[PDB]
């Protein structure tokens, strides 16, 4: 056999992310809970609006806005998980506004742009703003405010094929969004067993502030949402 | 409580406040090494006078996928503010005694088969089986395979033993209905859980390091193809 | 006929006039190479810039036997009334020219994967295609491969390389009825013969070489077993 | 990598050996001829009188005994393949008498019994003289003159998995008889596709003395004696 341990020193800024990353867990009291979303409606969605879609927009549909206005509206149903626990002052400061950070894939690495005032937006807006930082980004400037601030996180491991984990709270935020890989799966459906595409998400949230049942009930309104895109309009 | 099981509960929560670990899970389908082994097994025994479990072709596997991402080998060290790596690659394997569980070291895995991993493996159970196991049998593993499924775990979030950066949870095998090209089949399935040090591995790097584990297990022909 | 040609025929008449050769056949079921590398050729591609071609199974299932019986590696040597052994292993595969065939070699193949062989025989195949092939790159192999298949040959016998022991000859695939389970089937199979020195190798030996090429070839997984 | 190249001397009688075979090839004008065998009817008779066999003769009934007779019915019915080439004296000696040296395998090595005057001998005669050859040389007394001047061979690739091969002729004789592996194969059995347990059989003659149409209708003759035990009786 053989041993060696080369080595390389750590930079200021990765050992002041680890820092930050660490005072992550130690500030917030984190707890996980998961469900299955069935993605059969979206996808059938955008496989015939794609084209038509794309003409108008001049755009490539995903299902990215569909989670991201989903989570919105939930997030506008239930103030308190748009809220923040400030710990300096020993205060809940709410949010009446609604902002976003989702994360972007770059060779160089992965960095989480914001998307704000996610509360008056469309599909179309929320893709277009997706994209348009998504190539902003891919090019390196992207400036400090444009990362500064947000209040939910929708975070994307499944495009690398995971089926579910726990996500860590982006540290000024009480919850985490976490999706998943889409997988078909056998599911029941009326009474028999069926195949649908599915998928697991995760959520995290601070259990200081956000009580067991409040977060249930929010992945719910999420998956309630995403299943049926059609209760954004009633406003259900 | 004694002296030696305060330090061990003193030690585990040093492991927590210590590194930022998370969890990612995943599943693996198991026929193709239960339908290897179901036929190798007398062959393999003749001639190595041995049983042909499953263990072996994990742990081979689990090397492979670390060789593949030195990332994941590597383990940070605050006391100097040093990342170091390492070139070799040993891995430490949980195994069973009435009087408790313990974990020796598989030394330089890198270049052993699944025979030699095996007569290893079979060398310290019966070697710690009596209470003879030394410290450097045990001393400095760069990763780990925790066995809670032959208790009949579904799946768990396992700890990371201090000096290292990541961990593997294996699970109770389960016969469950997958989808295999489009129509609904029964498969024996197994779920697998990593556990790693967020500060050091990003989750991409950590969902890639279990699905290469994942193709290293499901088809071992890909470790012939250093695919 | 030119001075080489004639060299060339000599030496070929000194081959059968110092070895005893003999021949033995046997067949090998094709279906798990052709499966393998029909879905993991696309990765292997990407990966590694290389075309996942079946020869590079045979090779390393040649190297494996030859491991197992040391003595097919030998070679008899009348100037002294010795018999070498060697602990290494070399092997020479035949490449295609438009201007004729030669035989590069492949050193020490035993610490080689898959993805290493096709390396070597693509770059030798490339490097053969022009002349600037040299000497030291085609002396002194232990073991040989033959390639009649790519002609449609059904089965032949070869002729063992002066200084060595045995000769491999592939030849090509054909769909042919088998009886799998009691049942006729079809399925891709392919003719091998070996042609050895029976002065050195007994027939028995020469049977459980061919044999143990077949098992290596017919389920890759038997390498990683040391079975 | 690594190179080593120790050795060992070759020994006087292996040697000789080796002398004694390229002799044998430097000798003979060795040509070979191929067929297949349907080996139904002998599995099936012994696989019904083995237990009666057992009982009454204290024996094991395999399907040596029956290539040996079928041999020694084809050599009787053809003289010259049964008589050898003389160069010392330029003759071509015949013999009336048949004796058929078999191969034994031990855990040192094979060696070649001789089985005198087979043309008398019914199959339990050939078993019992196979088995007390088969335990006399597994311990090593066994002496020259039990394995000196056989007229004809037998030699057992089968037990080892092979398919079909060239035997080598022993040095003072005229042809040899070399089987292989039962294998089941499908073959058409009056037009149909059927399953049946084949094996190659393959004979290695000198061409000096045997012609080709003699040694291809002895290998007929054999075929025909092996797949229907009758024709023995028959004397067809």
């Given amino acids: 056999g053989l041993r060696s341990e080369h080595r390389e020193k750590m930079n200021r800024m990765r050992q002041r992310i680890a820092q930050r990353l660490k005072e992550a867990q130690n500030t917030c009291a984190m707890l996980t809970t998961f469900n299955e979303i069935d993605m059969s409606n979206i996808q059938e969605m955008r496989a015939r609006h794609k084209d038509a ?90 400036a400090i405010e444009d990362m500064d601030g947000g209040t939910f996180t929708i975070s994307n491991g499944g495009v690398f094929g995971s089926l579910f984990g726990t996500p860590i709270i982006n540290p000024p935020q009480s919850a985490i969004l976490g999706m998943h890989a889409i997988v078909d799966r056998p599911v029941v459906i009326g009474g028999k067993v069926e195949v649908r595409p599915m998928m697991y998400v995760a959520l995290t949230y601070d259990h200081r502030l956000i009580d067991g049942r409040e977060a249930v009930t929010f992945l719910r309104k999420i998956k309630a949402a995403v299943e049926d895109p059609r209760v954004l309009l009633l406003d259900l």
Avoid at 58 to 78: P, Y
Avoid at 98 to 115: C, F, H, M, N, Q
């Fill in 53 to 142: 879609f794309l003409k108008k927009h001049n755009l490539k549909l995903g299902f990215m806005s569909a989670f991201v206005k989903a989570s919105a509206f939930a997030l506008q149903e239930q103030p308190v998980v748009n809220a923040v626990i400030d710990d300096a002052t020993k205060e809940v400061v709410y949010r009446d506004y609604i902002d976003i950070s989702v994360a972007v894939a770059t060779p160089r690495g992965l960095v989480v742009p914001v998307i704000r005032n996610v509360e008056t937006m469309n599909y179309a807006d929320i893709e277009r703003t997706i994209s348009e930082l998504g190539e902003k980004a891919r090019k390196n400037e992207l």
